Design a protein around this ligand. Structure first.
Ligand SMILES: [Cl-]
Ligand SMILES: [Cl-]
Ligand SMILES: [Cl-]
Ligand SMILES: [Cl-]
Ligand SMILES: [K+]
Ligand SMILES: [Mg+2]
Ligand SMILES: [Mg+2]
Ligand SMILES: [Mg+2]
Ligand SMILES: [Mg+2]
Ligand SMILES: [Mg+2]
Ligand SMILES: [Mg+2]
Ligand SMILES: [Mg+2]
Ligand SMILES: [Mg+2]
Ligand SMILES: [Mg+2]
Ligand SMILES: [Mg+2]
Ligand SMILES: [Mg+2]
Ligand SMILES: [Mg+2]
Ligand SMILES: [Mg+2]
Ligand SMILES: [Mg+2]
Ligand SMILES: [Mg+2]
Ligand SMILES: [Mg+2]
Ligand SMILES: [Mg+2]
Ligand SMILES: [Mg+2]
Ligand SMILES: [Mg+2]
Ligand code: NA
Ligand code: NA
Ligand code: NA
Ligand code: NA
Ligand code: NA
Ligand code: NA
Ligand code: NA
Ligand code: NA
Ligand code: NA
Ligand code: NA
Ligand code: NA
Lengths: 92, 237, 56, 194
RNA sequence: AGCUUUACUGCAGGCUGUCGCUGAGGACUCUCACUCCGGGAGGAGGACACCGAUAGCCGGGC
RNA sequence: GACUCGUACGGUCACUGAAUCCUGCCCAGUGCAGGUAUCUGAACACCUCGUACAAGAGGACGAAGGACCUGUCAACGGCGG
RNA sequence: GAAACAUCUCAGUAUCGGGAGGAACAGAAAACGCAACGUGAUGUCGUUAGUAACCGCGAGUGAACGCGAUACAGCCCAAAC
């Protein structure tokens, strides 16, 4: 479906309707310093490594909407539920 | 499965060993401080069980009695010589350096003093080609050009018993008897005729290899069978 | 040839014999080792924990 | 002022630089051609020896023991083993090479008891340790107020029971507080969890 | 349970880089460790190889 | 340590299975092997960022191997609509 | 066992190798860390507690400091001279 790059709507922060801008959440890079990263190194040795020996799952036929709503005045973004959509394009 | 035959071999049990206790003499060149003054007389010509070829008994000036890798034409009475100054005739042993190029040689040393390594089977012979203050080029019986120290000693002539391979064994019984004098398990069963458990080629409803016969060099023993690291197979092309 | 009764006939070889060290007829006169006490193999006496129940 | 010893010790703080370095590059050549256990008249590292209990006296012996380097020389499994126990290569022994040397030496001298040991270098494939042993039966020692303790019956085979210095350290008994819950008073008493 | 394989996961083994042993003056010389031949004298080789450690690949041989 | 008191007229690994007349075509896939501009290719050391250090992120170089190319069927096998 | 199974669990158990004693081992802090103006070698018992901690964060696994007791004990070299 098509979707407006910008539009009016409720900003949970300002607590009043304002022009938000919609962006697609870009994957944040990892530091490899989280506990899970440590436990991987720690708990991996000879033979099968248990949970650490598993591999990537699969894909759903369609993914849900992963968007960021940015307030046009305070610049503070907010998240919303997503909806299944084969393709999402922004208008303007 | 079970270790394949090639694996039982390594263990060195009876079945796979050579009846050493029945072998005559570890044929190796004599040693001479220097000078070359050494020489002995051929006393007899015997049959060497280990090589199915004749070997000559010799008594040296210093009363030393030993068997020698005999070239062709060496008869009793003959006088052989072993040293830097040894004459250039068949039977004599001397460093490649002193041997004239173009002369057929047998029982050549790899490293000077090792007592002989190359060319020692029935009728084979190496070939001295190039001389140098550094390297002596010998063309081994396999057709390969071997670069050797001109100090490596070797015997003049070709090994005795040549042509032994010309007559077929004709019957299993003749192989049997020969085989019994070597470190070899005989007869031979083809993998393809065994059970899957016993060999990578075993199994199936009919006899055939279950994979391509050409195995990788990096293959582990137990799986390395068939055509080992073949650069090619067949006769065509 | 049956592996049974008929193959019993050739059994006239002597192996295990009265042991000089423990007195048991376990000395293999061909091996020169006692299967019971270990005489011939071990200076110490042949003994294993599995000769009785674990908690005993 | 600095003692003579201090110089011997200061030299070994860096066995790869200076004279000691050249010394080693030489000695090993002969050590390599020696046996597994070679009794030696004088300790190579006098300061260290003296420091560990050594005394130029009767009943006090010294021997250099050679032990191979690396992980455990292990045989791969010949029966069912879950992936965790299928290891061979990375498995290592729980006794450090130095404790292995102390044992191999003591076995060479069935009448003596291990007092201590110290390292004397290593080449590319082996490590050498000099072990100080003591004759618990020589009166020269039964009367030594600084060593007669090693004569008591309960000090018999002390190395094979890990009562040695490197023994106790290797048993993880160094700390008297945190981290020694499973080690003191004994590994076997703690259910072999240390 | 035995057996198979491009089933899952691992383990040997082979190949290969790297670190240590290990030294003098991206290609090169040397000799002194180390290796090998030699009865020895000495010869070949040589900081490689072997061995220890690690990394990538192959890996139903298990 | 066996082979081996052995040395290519050797002995290892496989297939076929006396003699006689013969043994066509296929290298695409798989296997083995050789080559390789370029691509891909780990760890150590090295460069940048980060941290008074460190974890960590990135770069440069690039082995075997793979991509790609070639050889090979008395190599696995194939010889149709 | 985990209602399969690979980490985990059974378990540092079974079993194996080496060795001491009448008991062994431990032991006079590079401790503790109820953080203190505090405790004061070490075993062990009761408790702390199925707590903290671990774990396909599944099934399961699992201490310590302290406290109350038992018994009490503190010393010898290396080196300086
Ligand atoms: Cl989206
Ligand atoms: Cl033959
Ligand atoms: Cl002892
Ligand atoms: Cl307290
Ligand atoms: K299990
Ligand atoms: Mg693992
Ligand atoms: Mg021989
Ligand atoms: Mg033939
Ligand atoms: Mg035979
Ligand atoms: Mg056959
Ligand atoms: Mg059959
Ligand atoms: Mg198989
Ligand atoms: Mg057939
Ligand atoms: Mg067939
Ligand atoms: Mg039967
Ligand atoms: Mg106790
Ligand atoms: Mg089954
Ligand atoms: Mg040698
Ligand atoms: Mg299997
Ligand atoms: Mg047939
Ligand atoms: Mg279960
Ligand atoms: Mg479950
Ligand atoms: Mg547990
Ligand atoms: Mg604590
Ligand atoms: Na851990
Ligand atoms: Na088959
Ligand atoms: Na002893
Ligand atoms: Na532990
Ligand atoms: Na079965
Ligand atoms: Na093809
Ligand atoms: Na091909
Ligand atoms: Na179950
Ligand atoms: Na099951
Ligand atoms: Na787990
Ligand atoms: Na309190």
């Amino acid at each position: 479906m098509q979707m407006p790059r910008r539009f009016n709507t409720y900003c949970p922060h300002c607590n009043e309707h304002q022009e938000h801008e919609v962006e697609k959440v870009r994957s944040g890079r990892q530091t490899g310093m989280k506990w899970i990263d440590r436990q991987r190194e720690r708990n991996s040795g000879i033979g099968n490594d248990g949970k650490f020996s598993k591999v990537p799952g699969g894909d759903k036929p369609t993914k849900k909407t992963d968007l960021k709503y940015r307030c046009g005045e305070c610049g503070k973004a907010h998240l919303r539920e997503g909806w299944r959509a084969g393709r999402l394009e922004f208008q303007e | 499965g079970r270790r394949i035959q090639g694996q039982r071999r390594g263990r060195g049990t009876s079945t796979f060993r050579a009846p050493s206790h029945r072998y005559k003499a570890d044929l190796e060149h004599r040693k001479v401080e220097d000078g070359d003054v050494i020489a002995g007389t051929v006393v007899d010509i015997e049959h060497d069980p280990a090589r199915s070829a004749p070997v000559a008994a010799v008594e040296f000036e210093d009363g030393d009695r030993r068997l020698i890798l005999a070239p062709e034409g060496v008869g009793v009475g003959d006088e052989l010589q072993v040293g830097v100054s040894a004459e250039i005739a068949p039977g004599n042993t001397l460093p490649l350096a002193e041997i004239p190029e173009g002369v057929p040689v047998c029982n050549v040393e790899s490293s000077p003093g090792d007592g002989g390594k190359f060319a020692r089977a029935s009728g084979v012979n190496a070939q001295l080609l190039t001389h140098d203050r550094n390297v002596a080029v010998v063309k081994l019986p396999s057709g390969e050009m071997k670069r050797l120290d001109p100090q490596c000693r070797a015997t003049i002539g070709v090994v005795a018993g040549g042509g032994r391979t010309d007559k077929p064994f004709v019957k299993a019984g003749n192989k049997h008897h020969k085989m019994k004098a070597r470190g070899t398990k005989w007869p031979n069963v083809r993998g393809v005729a065994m059970n899957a458990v016993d060999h990578p080629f075993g199994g199936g409803g009919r006899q055939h290899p279950g994979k391509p016969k050409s195995i990788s060099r990096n293959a582990p023993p137990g799986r390395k069978v068939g055509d080992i690291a073949s650069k090619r197979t067949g006769r065509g092309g | 040839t049956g592996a049974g009764t008929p193959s019993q006939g050739k059994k006239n070889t002597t192996t295990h014999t009265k042991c000089r060290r423990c007195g048991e007829k376990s000395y293999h006169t061909k091996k020169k080792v006692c299967s019971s006490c270990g005489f011939g193999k071990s200076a110490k006496r042949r003994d294993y924990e599995w000769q009785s129940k674990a908690g005993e | 002022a600095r003692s003579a010893y201090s110089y011997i010790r200061d030299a070994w703080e860096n066995p790869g630089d200076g004279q000691l370095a050249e010394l080693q590059w030489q000695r090993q050549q002969e050590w390599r051609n020696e046996g597994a256990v070679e009794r030696i008249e004088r300790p190579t590292r006098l300061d260290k020896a003296r420091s560990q209990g050594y005394k130029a006296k009767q009943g006090v012996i010294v021997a250099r023991v050679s032990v191979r380097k690396g992980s455990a020389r292990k045989r791969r499994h010949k029966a069912g083993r879950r992936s965790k126990r299928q290891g061979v290569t990375r498995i290592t022994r729980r006794k450090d090479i130095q404790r292995v040397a102390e044992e191999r030496a003591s076995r060479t001298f069935p009448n003596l008891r291990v007092l201590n040991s110290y390292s004397v270098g290593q080449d590319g494939r082996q490590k050498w340790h000099e072990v100080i042993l003591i004759d618990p039966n020589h009166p020269a020692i039964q009367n030594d107020d600084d060593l007669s303790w090693i004569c008591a019956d309960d000090q018999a085979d002390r190395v094979f029971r890990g009562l040695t210095g490197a023994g106790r350290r290797n048993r993880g008994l160094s700390g008297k507080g945190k981290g020694s819950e499973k080690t003191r008073p004994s590994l076997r008493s703690n259910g072999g969890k240390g």
